[PDB]
Amino acid sequence: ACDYTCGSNCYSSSDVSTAQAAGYKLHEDGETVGSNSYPHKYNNYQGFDFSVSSPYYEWPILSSGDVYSGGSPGADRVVFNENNQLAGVITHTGASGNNFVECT
Ligand SMILES: Nc1ncnc2c1ncn2[C@@H]1O[C@H](CO)[C@@H](O)[C@H]1OP(=O)(O)O
Numbered sequence: 001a002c003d004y005t006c007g008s009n010c011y012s013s014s015d016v017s018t019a020q021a022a023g024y025k026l027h028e029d030g031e032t033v034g035s036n037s038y039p040h041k042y043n044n045y046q047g048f049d050f051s052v053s054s055p056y057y058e059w060p061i062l063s064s065g066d067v068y069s070g071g072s073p074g075a076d077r078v079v080f081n082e083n084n085q086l087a088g089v090i091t092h093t094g095a096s097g098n099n100f101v102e103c104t
Pocket residue numbers: 036058073074075092093097098099
């Protein structure tokens with residue numbers, strides 16, 4: 001069973017923890033990877049019910065289980081705040097354009 005389901009992608013809590021740790025470290029270091037510069041600021045204009053405060057940052061989570069290293073970021077993202085608290089797991093899959101929907 002999946003702790004988070006993004007479109008057809010299945011993620012366990014461990015996958016999420018791993019991705020967040022990686023993205024957070026980059027953030028602390030003032031570093032980014034990829035053409036789209038991850039991690040990058042995330043604005044909650046869709047009003048997702050996040051239980052932690054902003055600012056928020058988005059970092060790609062890969063279906064493969066590997067940590068994002070600068071290539072295709074896919075559609076899924078982990079969202080974390082300035083304090084390294086998990087805000088949520090979202091995806092571009094099933095949303096129009098560059099918008100998002102929450103993973104279930
Ligand atoms: N797989 C994908 N599906 C839809 N939009 C995507 C995407 N990968 C990147 N984007 C969006 O494309 C634009 C330029 O790359 C950004 O708005 C980026 O949003 P993101 O960084 O929030 O994922």
